Amino acid sequence: TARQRVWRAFENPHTSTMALVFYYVTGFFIAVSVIANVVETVPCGSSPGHIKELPCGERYAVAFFCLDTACVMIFTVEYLLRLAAAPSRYRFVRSVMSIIDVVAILPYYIGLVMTDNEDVSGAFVTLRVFRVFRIFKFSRHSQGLRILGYTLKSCASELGFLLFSLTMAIIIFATVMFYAEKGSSASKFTSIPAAFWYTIVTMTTLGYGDMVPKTIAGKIFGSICSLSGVLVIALPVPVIVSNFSRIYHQNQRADKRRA
Amino acid sequence: TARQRVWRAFENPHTSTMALVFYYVTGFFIAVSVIANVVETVPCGSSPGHIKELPCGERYAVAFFCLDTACVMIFTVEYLLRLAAAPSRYRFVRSVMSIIDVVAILPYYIGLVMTDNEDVSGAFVTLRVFRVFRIFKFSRHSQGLRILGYTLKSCASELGFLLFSLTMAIIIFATVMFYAEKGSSASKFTSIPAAFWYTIVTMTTLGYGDMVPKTIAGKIFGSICSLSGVLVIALPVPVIVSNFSRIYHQNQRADKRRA
Amino acid sequence: TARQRVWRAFENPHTSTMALVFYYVTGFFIAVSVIANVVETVPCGSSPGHIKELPCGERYAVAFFCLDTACVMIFTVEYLLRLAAAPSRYRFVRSVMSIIDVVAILPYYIGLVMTDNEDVSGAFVTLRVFRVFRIFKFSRHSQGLRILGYTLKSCASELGFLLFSLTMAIIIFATVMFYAEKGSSASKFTSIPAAFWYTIVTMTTLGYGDMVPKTIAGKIFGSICSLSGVLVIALPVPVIVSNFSRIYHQNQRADKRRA
Amino acid sequence: TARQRVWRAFENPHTSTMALVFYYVTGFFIAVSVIANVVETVPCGSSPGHIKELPCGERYAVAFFCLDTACVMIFTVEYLLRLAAAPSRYRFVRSVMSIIDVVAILPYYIGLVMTDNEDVSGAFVTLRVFRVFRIFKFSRHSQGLRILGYTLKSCASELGFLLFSLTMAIIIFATVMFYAEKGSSASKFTSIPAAFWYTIVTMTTLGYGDMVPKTIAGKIFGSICSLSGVLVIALPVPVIVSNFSRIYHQNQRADKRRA
Ligand SMILES: [K+]
Ligand SMILES: [K+]
Ligand SMILES: [K+]
Ligand SMILES: [K+]
């Protein structure tokens, strides 16, 4: 029944002090890995023996590699233990969180096996991006009751419909703006996909201001887009508020049910 | 009983499998026409024998014309069958979906009969814009768009009042901003219609930043406009969500009446 | 009882057809006055006998003066009739709407009596601004049930508290940003009142981008300001939604009470 | 029974008219100190005998110092009486209003004892910033601030979770934007902390426009970030309004219990 004990330690950390300490140390390692990934891109000053400043990941490549490999060893042993402790190993692997784990650790090994092609580009940057997946294990650690997550799932149909309507509106407004502004001087509306950027920025009430209309027709349709954007940004608030109230009351009723 | 069978197959595609196949085929062609319209404006890049990169709709004008006319023939045939199978031709034409189909289908024929004036300026832009309403045919492919349109129809007098109040506030704030900003050096507030743009951008909380006040009075009234825009973000939500909720409740009442 | 008849015609337009036609013609004159004020600032092209283009109000000064004086005569006779028809003339004058009327018409007469000092500045622009008050008579004409107005009055305490808290937050964040950014190169945070503009723009989620932080401390506190701005723009929506629902239900219950 | 009478006069200014006078006097001095802090940074304009316009706090450093020390002596005396009249000195000091008073009152004395190092850089900025918390003493002058602070205390774990989730999303989006934008020419995404600014600006729907993506991948992920920001505008509203409504209901329950 050893698998039962280790699985109970993993899936339920507060039951045993050993489970709690393992949970806390692996959370600490997750946090240090995230911070190391963020910090290795910060340029170090004083330009030691170089024309320009180097990032922390290049000036201290060995140190950051040691930190990354320590974090990856911890994550790998933890994942293998979870795999060997799962009552249904196939079902555990089919879980989304196991997918997050595997896609978080495998970038390191892929970078290892491509050491011969050290000058790799496009795939190297993509692997370094995929290292961001380690953050998603925080929600395994900050696994507090997902009342907001449950309410977001409660509005999944509304969000899907809102995204479809947003796609329709974006295409329509982008067509209109491109044809209203294709002819301006040094125009940034060089195509309908180019106006996708303006439309998505306007309908979310960002307004960066890099692409702004310069024609009277362009400004009229940009105003229509702005009002549609006000509606877009404003709709979800009462929906989420009502759903959150309902779910919180359901959870309190379940609490008084279990008591 | 053949024409009415065809008509009910049009209304209810899920009944007959052949009707469902025709439904999915026309939906796929709608999506293809929309994507072709969006893509034909993209610059091809490194145009062969041309310094400037031509749009893909100009590099391959023959291929894009053939694809467009294929989609247009499909739409015209489908509309003609919808006209023949419809019991009341006048009322069916009066149905808003029929108007959408008509306004999406003529632009191709208008471009056809206008081939003598192939050197036009402006009108071709309007026709190519009107080609975008092929998207609205997707209303026939979703219950969400149908209920959204019903809600928008419900919020007609109320959203009209909100648009009227927004127009009032826009004129007031544009007046005060033009008069505060007309004297500035190299000012963009050259008139009150010119300040309509700044006012509508500020209320919607875009803030592109192309027109910003540069005087103390202008900045004061811009702050007032910004706060009024914060209120604008909230003004139409009660009406929209109340009408939508009423429609939702009546729909669930009908659904339980079905049971 | 003539005063009774004329007062009933004024305060209740739909009772008599004469009252309705007078109401509609004075509304038409209000609209034409508003449009004339907006249009007289639009620059006329072709620069007739001038170095630069003239606005419609200067190229056609006589025509716009005739239009303005016709509108002012109509407004003046209407206001005098209302004054002579009011059962309590002092109480009628004490009404806010009579104040709006008097402040809408008197700018014209003040401009008349200052014809000797035709080169007046600062007060002339202020009078032309005060001509915007004619728009507020639309809400006398579009006097439809102010459910939104009643709900806004229902939240008057909440809005007052929100403005006080907004003033506190603006002063605090402006102090912090000015002291974080007083030393940057060519800094636009030249004073705490200068940073009032940045703070009010950031806390409303405009982000024009003319004043942006350039220091690490400035960016940190700008991020705190941005989050506070998200809260500011987001709070009023559920409040107004609930109040609107409550007031609409109260009004429907009053309707079924009167029936 | 004199000390406790003084203490209850401090707690309940409306009881004794002399207590109310002292209350309004200290509130007026708080407002005066706040306005003096704000105004002393304004450039005086056309400095006599100086090319650069000095701030009013430097043109009249003696007058502003005298006004500041008057306000500080009033605050120090008022705090000393609050300390003497308080029954439990330790607990009263532990009360948050006492901490606010202390942190607002020391900066003047810290500047006093530091007069030897009158040539400091940076520390004086921190002290002058800490002078802004004289505003928070207005919490003693409003029930709205008190209930707002109680609500913020209630939304402690939940708003902590929201800040944690915002940090997670900010790190993820900053990573993807830095890696999409690091290769651009003259890019402002020089690191992941550098892209923290763009990410937090985009989620809050500011869009200053100083940092904008200039690559197709960057624009795609910026659009995703913009939509996530639209969701951010709605995420904390349910918690805030639910806790505030619970506090409001309990307050009305207590008020009717008073009746
Ligand atoms: K901007
Ligand atoms: K916004
Ligand atoms: K914005
Ligand atoms: K903006």
Tags for this model:
Four Helix Bundle (Hemerythrin (Met), subunit A); binds potassium ion; 13 helices; homotetramer; 2 domains; mainly alpha; 259 residues; two-stranded antiparallel ribbon
Descriptive notes:
Four copies of one chain form a homotetramer. With 259 residues, chain A is mainly alpha-helical. The first copy, chain A, folds into two domains: 2-144, Voltage-gated potassium channels. Chain C (Four Helix Bundle (Hemerythrin (Met), subunit A), Up-down Bundle); 156-236, Helix Hairpins (Orthogonal Bundle). Chain A is 72% helix and 2% strand. Chain A contains 13 helices and two strands, in the order ααββααααααααααα. The first copy, chain A, has helices spanning 2-11, 17-39, 56-59, 61-85, 89-94, 96-113, 123-130, 138-141, 147-154, 156-181, 192-203, 216-234, 236-258, and strands at residues 43-44, 54-55. Chain A has a two-stranded antiparallel sheet. In chain A, α1 (2-11) crosses α4 and α4 (61-85) crosses α6 (96-113). The first copy, chain A, starts with a helix and ends with a helix. Chain B binds chain C through residues 161, 164-165, 168, 171-172, 174-176, 178-179, 182, 190-193, 202, 205-209, 212, 219, 223, 226-227, 229-231, 233-235, 237-239, 241-242, and chain C through 34, 37-38, 41-43, 55, 125, 128-129, 132, 135, 138-139, 142, 144, 148, 151, 166, 197, 200-201, 204-210, 232-233, 236-237, 240-241, 243-245, 248. Bound molecules: potassium ion (K) (4 copies). Chains A, B, C, D: This is A-type voltage-gated potassium channel KCND2. Chains A, B, C, D: Residues 193-204, 205-212 dip into the membrane without crossing it. Chains A, B, C, D: Belongs to the potassium channel family. D (Shal) (TC 1.A.1.2) subfamily. Kv4.2/KCND2 sub-subfamily. Chains A, B, C, D: Residues 42-61, 117-122, 181-192, 213-215 are extracellular. Chains A, B, C, D: A motif (Selectivity filter) lies at residues 205-210.
